[PDB]
Design a protein around this nucleic acid. Structure first.
Ligand SMILES: Nc1ncnc2c1ncn2[C@@H]1O[C@H](COP(=O)(O)OP(=O)(O)OP(=O)(O)O)[C@@H](O)[C@H]1O
Lengths: 154, 316, 835, 86, 86
RNA sequence: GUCCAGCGUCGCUGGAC
C-alpha cells in the first residue's frame, strides 16, 4: 500500500497502524491473533476472485441461487461430537461490507496454543475448552476501504 | 441591589456612582488572597476588549488598605515608563524602602526615642547596603576574578544559609525584615500592561520566577497572553546554536525544532500563571443574564432627576 | 499508599512523604547511591518536561540527609548569573559547610592546623582561577606556573585545576568526617544555552571518587545542545564551500557519532533513570496497576474515602462531556493521563475547586473553563477562536470547520476524536468536545443547528467542491466559507437555501433532477405528459399540507429560476420554530420566512375558506407541540459524538436513496404501489424517514440519559426503499421498554419530540407514496399503528387510511399533489417491468 | 550601580507620590513653579512636522507619552498620519 | 472603519456613500444593507448601530427621502452584486 | 426451495416461511 522508498512518513505511519491493530506487544490471546490475520489477508483479492486464500478458504453463509449436484451451504449442525468441536475451533467471522466466514488453519494453531498453557485440573479444562470454541468477530483493518461501512452495520 | 443614578450631582463622566459593577468579583478575589497567605502566588487578571483593568486593580488595592490581616500593598509600576536599562528589581526595592521609610519617620510622633526605633533603622540600612554590593552581578558582562573573594567572604549574621552571593536570598531577608517592621503579613506587587512597549514583558517574566518566589509575597499581573506567548517563544529560539540553524535545515529538523519550542512555552505559562488562579472580568450581558432568565444579580437604572429608587427600571 | 490533596498548595516545596507519586523510584535511587560509595560515578534522572523532576530530586536529597554522605544545597544553573563559572559556585557551597562545622568545635587544640590547611587551599584556587576568566593568553603567568608546591607534591606540574579541586575535596571530607559528597544539579530546561558550562565542568573537574553527581533533565534537549556545539568545530569556509549533497551526507553522520560518543562517556547508560509517566503507574483499564493513587475531591475528606485517579478523571469526563460510560469515554481519559503531571494536576485542581464552590450547576460549563485555560497554547497554534465573550453557536460552527481543515480528514473528522498525531490537534479535540456538550445541552433548537450547520458544511464541501494545487485549495476554501457565510448565519432555513445552490450546479450523469435529498420540480409546462403528470402547484394543498410543503421550497436564480424540494429546509423550519415561545406570531413567521422574500445567486466557482384563518389549526397544533418541547428538552444531554454519528448515518442514507430512485420513474409511476416504481412523493418520503431513522438508532446507543442500549443484537440497516427496517426496530424497542417499566420520554427524548412533530407528519404518509401489496400492508398497518401509539393520538381516520391503501375528501393533513408532479430531466418514455 | 546609593536619599519636599529618580514627577513640579511665577493658567508647547527627516519623530513621541501628561500643558503637534504610522 | 465622521455636513449625499463603503469592507452584497451587527470586527459592529440610527433620522417625516433610500441606498448594492460583480 | 429486503460493482448478506 505504501512504498518503502517513495515515502517514509507514510510508510512509518502505516507501521504504527499494523502494530496496534494486530495487538503485537499486548498478546491478549493466540486465537485473537489468528482472527485478525484473516481480515488482513482477505483485504486484497486475487485476479480470479476465488475464495481460496493463503491459509484459509472462504465458506458461504447463504446458499447461492442454484447448485449443480449435492453442493450446499455448511450447516455446522451436521457434525457429530468431536468433529464439531474441531470445526467450531476453526470457523471464524469477519465484520466487513457483508459478514464472511473462513476456515483458517491459523485458528487451529491458536486453539492448541491456548489449551497447552493450562497446567490445571479437569474442572478448568472443561471451561478452557469451552472458551476456545465460540463465535468471534474482528473488524476490518483501518487501512481498508470498508472500515466506515463495517463500523455502522456491525 | 444595584442602583445607578444618571443624574449625579456633579454630572461626572461615565457615571461611576457607587459599587461600580464588579463588587461581587472584587470581594471574591480579595477573599482568595487572604486564604493563600494564611510558593507561587501569581494572579493574572485578564483585561481585554478595552476594559478598565487598571480601575478594577486600584479598587482591589484600595480595598486591601483596610484589611483584617492587613497585607499592605505597593504602588502600581508600569513597565513601559521605567528607564530602559533599569532592572525591574529596582522599582520594587525603591517602592518598599520608600513605603517603609515613611513609617519609621512617623514613629517619631508615636515615640520620640525608643529601643526599637534606633535598632530597626540601623538594621534596615545594613540590609540595603548588603544588596547594593551584590547588585553588581546583574548587568555585568564578564566575570572578573575579584568577585571570588566576596563570594568566599562570610557574614556571621543575617543567617545566609546557602553560600555565595545568591541574590535571591538577599532579597528574601529584606522582604522578611520589612514585613516585621511594618507589622503586616504580606507585601503585594501589581504589574500593569506591556502593550505600549512589547519587549518590557521579558524582563518582568524572568524577574517573577527569580526574585519574587517567597511565602510572604503576592503579585497581581494584568494584560493578555497573546503577547506573553509570543514573547516566550521568541526567547526560546535564541539559545539554539546559530551555526546549527543553517546546517540542519532539511525540512525534517524544522518540524522537530518547532514541535519542541511549542512544548517549552506551554510548560512555561503554566508554571508562572496557574490556571486555577487566572481570573476573568464578567461582562454586562453575563451579569444581568438573557431576557426571561434571572441570571446573576439584577441592575436598576435611574432616568430622571429626583427619581425615586422604588421606580428605577431594569438596565435591559 | 498515595493520596493527593487537591485543596493544598501542591508545589515542590510543600510536598510530604505521603504525597509523592514516585515513592518507589526514590527508594531505588537512594540505595543505588549508597552502594556505589560502599564498593564515572554520575547519574541522570531522565524525564520529559513537566514530569516533576525538581520534586523528585528534593525527595532524594532530603531522604539522604535524614554510608555517611553530606548533601550540598541544590544548584540550578538557570538562576545563577549568566557569566559565573560552576567551579566558583560549587566551591562557595563547600566554604559555608566546613566553616559552620569548624565554629562548632569552639576552642581547638589541634584543629587550628586544619583551619589554615583549608584557608591555604582556598587561596591556592583563587590564584589559578584566572584561567577560566582570561580572554587572551597572558604569558607573564608562566613563571608563576613553574612553581613547585612543597605540600601534597603534585605529580603533574602546572596549575592543573582538576588536581587542585581533587585535593580540596579530600581535605574537606576529613574536616566533615564523611566518605562522599553529593552535588545535585537541577534542570536546564528553561535556559539550556548555559547548560553547556555545567557539562564541561562535570567532565573536566568532578572526576574524583569522593564526589557523586546527580544530574537532572530530559535527554532530547541535550541531544540538540551537544550536536549544535559539534558543528562549530568545523571551519566555516569549509562548510561554505563543500555544500554538495554527497559531502553533506557524510559530514552529518560524523557529528552524530561524535555526539553519541559524548553522552556515553559523560552519563553511563547503566546509571540512567527514566521518570515513569502517570499512565504507566496506574496501568491501563482493569490491569492491576503497579501503584495505586487516590485524591480528595471534596474538602475535609477523610483518608478512608478517596476515589481512584482514573475514576477522578473518569466521572469528570463522563459528566463534563455528557458521554456514556464505555470504550469511547475511556479513550479520552487514557489520553489525559499521558499529559505531563503539572498540566494534569492543574486541570483537576481547577475543576473540583470550582465545582465545590458552586455546590458550596451546569457541569460542562465547569469543564470548558478548565480545559480552555490549560490547553490555551494549543489553541493559538491551531488558529482556533480565542475570544471569551464571543462564545456561542456561531463561533463553534466555525471552529469545527477550521479544525477538520487542519486534520485533513473530511470523511469522519467531525467526530472530534483524539486521534491526530499532532500534539496540538490532540489537545484541541478534548477542548472542542467540551464546547459542544456545553452549548448544546438543554435545548433542541441548538442541537438541530449543530447537526445541520456544524457537520453539514464539512460533508457537503468534501463531495461537491473539492473535486475541482495549493493555491486553488485555500481559494476554494476562502470562497466557500464566505459564500455560505458560516459563522455569521442568520437562520438554519437561510443556510439550507444556500445549500441548494452548491449541490445543484455540479452536473450528474443522465442530468436527472433528483439530487442529495432534494427534488428539482418544474416551473415551465412541457407538452405531451403521459398519465396525469402536470406542473406542481401549491394551491391544491389546503391546510397543514400547504404549510409543510411551503417549508420545503427554495428558489435559486442562475440564468433561470429553479425550484427544489429540500429535506434540509424542514430541519431549518423545525430549528427556527422551536427557538422561542414568547410570541404566537413567531410560529407563522417561520413558514414564510424565506419562501418569497429573498433570492440566492449561483456560487462563483460554478463553471457556468376565509383566506385569513387558514392557519388557525396548524398554528394551534404547533402551539400545543411547543408545550411538550419546553418540558422534555430540559433533560437532554447531547454529546460531541452523538451529533457526529447521527449525521454519518443520515448522510449515508440520503446518498443511497438518491441513487436507487433515478431509474424508477418510468411512465406510470403515479399512484406508486409496487416497490419498483417511484415518484416525487416516494423520494421525499424516504428523505424524511431517513432523518427519523438515524435519530432512533444512534440516540439509543450513545445518548447520555439512557444507561444501556435497547436496540439489541442484530444488524442495523436503513430503509432505502422499503419501510420494514424502520418499523422493525420500534417493535423491538416497544417490548423492551414495556417489559422494564419505562416510557419513551425518559429514554428517547430526541426521537419522541421529532416523531410527534406536526410539520413532519404530512410527509410521513404522502398520498402517492405508500407501498401496496399482499405483504407490504402488513408492515404499513403495523407501522401506522405503532406511530399512533407513541404520539398518543391517531393521525389518520378510518376513512382517510382506507383511501390511502385502497384504490374525494378535503385532506387537511396529507400532501395530495406531489405524486403527480413532474421532475426536470425525467423524460417519461419507458414503462414499468412486470414480474 | 553606584547611583543606587545616590538615590534613596528621600526628601519630603513636594511630597512625591512615588519614590525613585523618575524624571516625569520632577519635571511636573518644575512646570507648576513656572506657572505660579509667570501667572499663567497653562503653558502651550508647539511642535512641527517631520517630513524632511521623520526618524527624529520617534523621540518626540516618547517625550510626549512620558513627560507631558499634566493639566498645565497643552501640546499642538503637526505632521502626517500616513507617515507617523510607518 | 473609514466612514464619514464630520460632526456636521450630514445629509442624503453622505449616507449613501457610507452604506456602500460599509458593505464593501464587510464583503456582504447579499443582505448587507440591513445594517445588522453580525461581523467579526469590533470596529464594524460599532459602525452598524451608528449607521442604522442615521438612516431613521434622515428619512423621517418625508416621502421623497424615503424613496431615495430605497433606490440609491439599497438599489445600488443589489444591482452591483448581480450584474457588475460577475 | 419460495417471498420480501438490504450491501458492493452479477456477486454477497439479513428476515419470515
Ligand atoms: N510528588 C508530587 N506530589 C504532588 N504533586 C506533584 C508531585 N510531583 C509533581 N507534582 C505536580 O507536578 C508539578 C511538577 O512541578 P516540578 O517543578 O516538580 O516539575 P519540573 O517540570 O521538573 O520543573 P522544575 O523546572 O522546577 O524542575 C508540580 O507543580 C505539581 O503540581
Amino acid at each position: 500500500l505504501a512504498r518503502a522508498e517513495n515515502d517514509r512518513e507514510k510508510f512509518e505511519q502505516l507501521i504504527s497502524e499494523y502494530v496496534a491493530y494486530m495487538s503485537v506487544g499486548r498478546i491478549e490471546s493466540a486465537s485473537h491473533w489468528a482472527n485478525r490475520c484473516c481480515a488482513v489477508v482477505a483485504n486484497s483479492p486475487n485476479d480470479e476472485k476465488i475464495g481460496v486464500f493463503l491459509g484459509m478458504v472462504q465458506l458461504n453463509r447463504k446458499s447461492r441461487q442454484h447448485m449443480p449436484g449435492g453442493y450446499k451451504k455448511f450447516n455446522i449442525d451436521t457434525e457429530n461430537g468431536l468433529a464439531k468441536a474441531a470445526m467450531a475451533s476453526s470457523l471464524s467471522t469477519v465484520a466487513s461490507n457483508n459478514l464472511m466466514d473462513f476456515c483458517s488453519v491459523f485458528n487451529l494453531i491458536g486453539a492448541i496454543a491456548d489449551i497447552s498453557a493450562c497446567r490445571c485440573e479437569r474442572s478448568a479444562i472443561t471451561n478452557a475448552f469451552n472458551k476456545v470454541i465460540a463465535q468471534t468477530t474482528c473488524i476490518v483493518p483501518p487501512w481498508s476501504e470498508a472500515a466506515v461501512r463495517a463500523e455502522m452495520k456491525g | 441591589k444595584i442602583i445607578i443614578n444618571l443624574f449625579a450631582p456633579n454630572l461626572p463622566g461615565s457615571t461611576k456612582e457607587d459599587d461600580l459593577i464588579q463588587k461581587s468579583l472584587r470581594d471574591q478575589l480579595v477573599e482568595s488572597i487572604r486564604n493563600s497567605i494564611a510558593g507561587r502566588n501569581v494572579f493574572f487578571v485578564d483585561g481585554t476588549r478595552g476594559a478598565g483593568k487598571t480601575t478594577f486593580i486600584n479598587s482591589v488595592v484600595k480595598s486591601l488598605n483596610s484589611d483584617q490581616d492587613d497585607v499592605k500593598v505597593n504602588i502600581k509600576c508600569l513597565p513601559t515608563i521605567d528607564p530602559t536599562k533599569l532592572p525591574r528589581h529596582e522599582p520594587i526595592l525603591v517602592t518598599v524602602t520608600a513605603r517603609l521609610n515613611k513609617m519609621v519617620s512617623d514613629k517619631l510622633k508615636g515615640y520620640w526615642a525608643s529601643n526599637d526605633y534606633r535598632k530597626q533603622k540601623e538594621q534596615w540600612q545594613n540590609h540595603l547596603a548588603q544588596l547594593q554590593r551584590g547588585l553588581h552581578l546583574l548587568t555585568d558582562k564578564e566575570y572578573k576574578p575579584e568577585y571570588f573573594s566576596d563570594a568566599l567572604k562570610l557574614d556571621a549574621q543575617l543567617d545566609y544559609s546557602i553560600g555565595g552571593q545568591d541574590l535571591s536570598e538577599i532579597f528574601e531577608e529584606l522582604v522578611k525584615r520589612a514585613c516585621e517592621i511594618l507589622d503586616c503579613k504580606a507585601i503585594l506587587i501589581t504589574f500593569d500592561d506591556i502593550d505600549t512597549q512589547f519587549d518590557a514583558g521579558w524582563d518582568v517574566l524572568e524577574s517573577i520566577r527569580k526574585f519574587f518566589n517567597s511565602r510572604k509575597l503576592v503579585v497581581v499581573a494584568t494584560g493578555d497572553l497573546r503577547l506573553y506567548s509570543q514573547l516566550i517563544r521568541g526567547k526560546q529560539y535564541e539559545n539554539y546554536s546559530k551555526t546549527l540553524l543553517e546546517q540542519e535545515k532539511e525540512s525534517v529538523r524544522l518540524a522537530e525544532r518547532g514541535y519542541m519550542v511549542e512544548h517549552l512555552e506551554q510548560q512555561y505559562l503554566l508554571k508562572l500563571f496557574p490556571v486555577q488562579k487566572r481570573i476573568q472580568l464578567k461582562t454586562m450581558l453575563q451579569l444581568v443574564g438573557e431576557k426571561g432568565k434571572a441570571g446573576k444579580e439584577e441592575i436598576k437604572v435611574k432616568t430622571e432627576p429626583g427619581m425615586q429608587d422604588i421606580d428605577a427600571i431594569d438596565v435591559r | 499508599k498515595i493520596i493527593i490533596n487537591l485543596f493544598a498548595p501542591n508545589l515542590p516545596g510543600s510536598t510530604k512523604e505521603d504525597d509523592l507519586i514516585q515513592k518507589s523510584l526514590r527508594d531505588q535511587l537512594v540505595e543505588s547511591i549508597r552502594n556505589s560509595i560502599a564498593y564515572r560515578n554520575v547519574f541522570f534522572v531522565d524525564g520529559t518536561r513537566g514530569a516533576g523532576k525538581t520534586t523528585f530530586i528534593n525527595s532524594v536529597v532530603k531522604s539522604l540527609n535524614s554510608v555517611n554522605i553530606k548533601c550540598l544545597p541544590t544548584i540550578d544553573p538557570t538562576k545563577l548569573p549568566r557569566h559565573e563559572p560552576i567551579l566558583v559556585t560549587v566551591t562557595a557551597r563547600l566554604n559555608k559547610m566546613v566553616s559552620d562545622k569548624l565554629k562548632g568545635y569552639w576552642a581547638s587544640n589541634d584543629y587550628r592546623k586544619q583551619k589554615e590547611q583549608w584557608q591555604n587551599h582556598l587561596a591556592q584556587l583563587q590564584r589559578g582561577l584566572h584561567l577560566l576568566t582570561d580572554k587572551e593568553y597572558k604569558p607573564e603567568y608562566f613563571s608563576d606556573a613553574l612553581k613547585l608546591d612543597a605540600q601534597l607534591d603534585y605529580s603533574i606540574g602546572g596549575q592543573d585545576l582538576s588536581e587542585i579541586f581533587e585535593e580540596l575535596v579530600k581535605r574537606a571530607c576529613e574536616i566533615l568526617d564523611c566518605k562522599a559528597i553529593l552535588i545535585t544539579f537541577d534542570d536546564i530546561d528553561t535556559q539550556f544555552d548555559a547548560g553547556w558550562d555545567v557539562l564541561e565542568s562535570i567532565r573536566k573537574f568532578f572526576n574524583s571518587r569522593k564526589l557523586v553527581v546527580v544530574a537532572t533533565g530530559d535527554l532530547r534537549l541535550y541531544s540538540q545542545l551537544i550536536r549544535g556545539k559539534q558543528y562549530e568545530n568545523y571551519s566555516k569556509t569549509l562548510l561554505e564551500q563543500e555544500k554538495e549533497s554527497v559531502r553533506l551526507a557524510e559530514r552529518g553522520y560524523m557529528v552524530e557519532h561524535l555526539e553519541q560518543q559524548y553522552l556515553l562517556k559523560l552519563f553511563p547508560v547503566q546509571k540512567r533513570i527514566q521518570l515513569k509517566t502517570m499512565l504507566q503507574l496506574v496501568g491501563e483499564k482493569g490491569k492491576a496497576g503497579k501503584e495505586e493513587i487516590k485524591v480528595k475531591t471534596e474538602p475535609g475528606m477523610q483518608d478512608i474515602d478517596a476515589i481512584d485517579v482514573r475514576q477522578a478523571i473518569g466521572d469528570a469526563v463522563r459528566e463534563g462531556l455528557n458521554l456514556r460510560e464505555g470504550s469511547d469515554a475511556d479513550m479520552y481519559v487514557n489520553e489525559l493521563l499521558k499529559q505531563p503531571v503539572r498540566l494534569l494536576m492543574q486541570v483537576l485542581q481547577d475543576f473540583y475547586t470550582k465545582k465545590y464552590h458552586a455546590t458550596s450547576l451546569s457541569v460542562p460549563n465547569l469543564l470548558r473553563n478548565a480545559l480552555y485555560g490549560s490547553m490555551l497554547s494549543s489553541i493559538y497554534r491551531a488558529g482556533l477562536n480565542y475570544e471569551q465573550h464571543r462564545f456561542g453557536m456561531d463561533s463553534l460552527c466555525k471552529d469545527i470547520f477550521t479544525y477538520v481543515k487542519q486534520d485533513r480528514d473530511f470523511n469522519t473528522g467531525f467526530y472530534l476524536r483524539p486521534q491526530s498525531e499532532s500534539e496540538a490537534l490532540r489537545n484541541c479535540s478534548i477542548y472542542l468536545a467540551s464546547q459542544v456538550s456545553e452549548n448544546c445541552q438543554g435545548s433542541l433548537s441548538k442541537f438541530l443547528q449543530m447537526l445541520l450547520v456544524g457537520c453539514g458544511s464539512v460533508s457537503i464541501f468534501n463531495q461537491f467542491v473539492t473535486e475541482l494545487d495549493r493555491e486553488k485549495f485555500e481559494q476554494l476554501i476562502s470562497e466557500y466559507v464566505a459564500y455560505m457565510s458560516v459563522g455569521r448565519i442568520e437562520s438554519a432555513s437561510h443556510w439550507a437555501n444556500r445549500c441548494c445552490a452548491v449541490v445543484a450546479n455540479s452536473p450528474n450523469d443522465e442530468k436527472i433532477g433528483v439530487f442529495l435529498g432534494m427534488v428539482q420540480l418544474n416551473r415551465k409546462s412541457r407538452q405531451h405528459m403521459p398519465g396525469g403528470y402536470k406542473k406542481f402547484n401549491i394551491d391544491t394543498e389546503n391546510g397543514l399540507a400547504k404549510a409543510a410543503m411551503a417549508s420545503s421550497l427554495s428558489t435559486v436564480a442562475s440564468n433561470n429560476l429553479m425550484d427544489f424540494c429540500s429535506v434540509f429546509n424542514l430541519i431549518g423550519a423545525i430549528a427556527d420554530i422551536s427557538a422561542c415561545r414568547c410570541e404566537r406570531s413567531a410560529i407563522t413567521n417561520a413558514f414564510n420566512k424565506v419562501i418569497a422574500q429573498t433570492t440566492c445567486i449561483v456560487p462563483p466557482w460554478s463553471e457556468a375558506q376565509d383566506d385569513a384563518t387558514e392557519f388557525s389549526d396548524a398554528i394551534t397544533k404547533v402551539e400545543q407541540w411547543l408545550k411538550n418541547v419546553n418540558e422534555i428538552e430540559i433533560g437532554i444531554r447531547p454529546s460531541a459524538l452523538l451529533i457526529g454519528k447521527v449525521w454519518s448515518r443520515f448522510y449515508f442514507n440520503l446518498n443511497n436513496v438518491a441513487d436507487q430512485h433515478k431509474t424508477r420513474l418510468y411512465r406510470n409511476a403515479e399512484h406508486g404501489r409496487m416497490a419498483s416504481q417511484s415518484n416525487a412523493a416516494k423520494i421525499m418520503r424516504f428523505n424524511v424517514l431517513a432523518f427519523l431513522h438515524a435519530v432512533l438508532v444512534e440516540e439509543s446507543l450513545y445518548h447520555s440519559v439512557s444507561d444501556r442500549e435497547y436496540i439489541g443484537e442484530g444488524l442495523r440497516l436503513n430503509p432505502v426503499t422499503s419501510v420494514d427496517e424502520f418499523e422493525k426496530k420500534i417493535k423491538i424497542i416497544g417490548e423492551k421498554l414495556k417489559a422494564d417499566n419505562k416510557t419513551w420520554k425518559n429514554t428517547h427524548p430526541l426521537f419522541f419530540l421529532l416523531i410527534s412533530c406536526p410539520i413532519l407528519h404530512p410527509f410521513i404518509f404522502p398520498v402517492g407514496g405508500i407501498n401496496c401489496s399482499v405483504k407490504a400492508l402488513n408492515k404499513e398497518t403495523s407501522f401506522n399503528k405503532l406511530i399512533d401509539e407513541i404520539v398518543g393520538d391517531k393521525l389518520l381516520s378510518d376513512e382517510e387510511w382506507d383511501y390511502l391503501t385502497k384504490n374525494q375528501q378535503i385532506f387537511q393533513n396529507t400532501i395530495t399533489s406531489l405524486n403527480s408532479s413532474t421532475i426536470v430531466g425525467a423524460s417519461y418514455d419507458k414503462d414499468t417491468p412486470a414480474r
